[PDB]
Design a protein around this ligand. Structure first.
Ligand SMILES: *[C@@H]1O[C@H](CO)[C@@H](O[C@@H]2O[C@H](CO)[C@@H](O[C@@H]3O[C@H](CO)[C@@H](O)[C@H](O)[C@@H]3O)[C@H](O)[C@H]2NC(C)=O)[C@H](O)[C@H]1NC(C)=O
Ligand SMILES: *[C@@H]1O[C@H](CO)[C@@H](O[C@@H]2O[C@H](CO)[C@@H](O)[C@H](O)[C@H]2NC(C)=O)[C@H](O)[C@H]1NC(C)=O
Length: 308
């Protein structure tokens, strides 16, 4: 909608006061100068077509910890702790997915480093939605079930690291400088000196509610969840976020990579698709058990098929 910045030092300070210092919102953070229309852009979930997840007796009848990081359960999967930068697209839906299919190619797919192309997914699945006007996580995985994607070595994400700071530590351009339409769906690799490689799942499925999220994350590794972003979420800097103030900005897809307890507050460690500048080194914590902003509502995962 408006060119109205989303963060006001009244707003942030009211939010900070409301949240009961459980999580520090921040005014002069990395999103301070953000536009209503920009922030809505970032949240690209629009619109089950996947079968619901069946736990084997022993999956369901097992003892999940009360902390868990995928990075640490899988020290040898470099894909996990890497943080993506969707950029100035409503591409989170695709970026969220590819990030986890990369990770699952390691956790199960017997391929250490392979970054699945959010490029490929974001352009070529017209089933999923309309590139950078947003799409459906469910579909993303159904396409990796049906069609399959190429790696980011083949169709590297076509939008650079842009920043939402004046001065940037990691010396990025501003995101207020760009705004990107769906890219050309290509059928060979960007470089022609590189061959195409199909990567697919032999089964995608869907998840629901606190528990299923923890079993699925544990056994099979990070996967893709969405929640409703509220203005307040933009100012987030530390601690376990929960919606206290601000208008709804759309549905935003993120990679669930952990859970844990902080001074008696249940949380989900999550990998946010906006740079490593935003939140806590690119990640955020969100309240868990409340299904806060509906995080525990819709979850999308799959088992990467090991090639040849
Ligand atoms: C499919 O292939 C093409 C590459 O042939 C990709 O579209 C191209 O995206 C590149 C960046 O990845 C664009 O470069 C840009 O050019 C404009 C100048 O007009 C400039 O403003 C930007 O700073 C940047 O240098 C290129 O123009 C664009 N070309 C076409 C034909 O779309 C596309 O992103 C690829 N899709 C996937 C899924 O990787
Ligand atoms: C938010 O907006 C303004 C842009 O008008 C930024 O203010 C200037 O930033 C430069 C360096 O980046 C400083 O040298 C000046 O002191 C600032 N004031 C001026 C030019 O009057 C501000 O830094 C922006 N903040 C963020 C975090 O983006």
């Amino acid at each position: 909608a408006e060119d109205a910045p989303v963060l006001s030092k009244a707003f942030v300070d009211r939010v900070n006061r409301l949240n009961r210092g459980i999580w520090k919102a921040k005014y002069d953070g990395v999103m301070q100068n953000i536009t209503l229309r920009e922030a809505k852009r970032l949240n690209g979930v629009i619109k089950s077509i996947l079968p619901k997840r069946r736990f084997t007796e022993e999956e369901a009848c097992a003892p999940l910890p009360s902390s868990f990081d995928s990075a640490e359960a899988w020290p040898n999967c470099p894909t996990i702790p890497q943080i993506a930068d969707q950029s100035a697209c409503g591409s989170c839906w695709a970026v969220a997915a590819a990030s986890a299919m990369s990770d699952r190619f390691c956790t199960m797919g017997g391929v250490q480093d392979v970054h699945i192309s959010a490029g490929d997914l974001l352009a070529c699945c017209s089933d999923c939605g309309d590139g950078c006007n947003g799409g459906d996580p469910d579909r993303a995985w159904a396409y990796f079930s049906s069609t399959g994607l190429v790696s980011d070595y083949c169709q590297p994400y076509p939008f650079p690291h842009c920043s939402h700071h004046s001065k940037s530590k990691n010396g990025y351009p501003p995101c207020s400088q760009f705004n990107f339409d769906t890219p050309k769906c290509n059928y060979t690799c960007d470089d022609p000196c590189i061959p195409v490689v199909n990567y697919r799942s032999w089964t995608s499925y869907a998840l629901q509610g606190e528990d299923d999220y923890m079993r699925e994350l544990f056994f099979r590794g990070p996967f893709e969840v969405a929640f409703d972003v509220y203005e307040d979420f933009i100012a987030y800097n530390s601690g376990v976020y929960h919606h206290v103030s601000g208008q709804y900005l759309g549905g935003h897809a993120v990679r669930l990579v952990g859970w844990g307890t902080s001074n008696g507050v249940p949380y989900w460690k999550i990998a946010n698709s906006w740079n490593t500048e935003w939140g806590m080194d690119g990640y955020f914590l969100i309240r868990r058990g409340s299904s806060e902003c509906g995080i525990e509502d819709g979850g999308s995962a799959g088992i990467p098929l090991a090639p040849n």
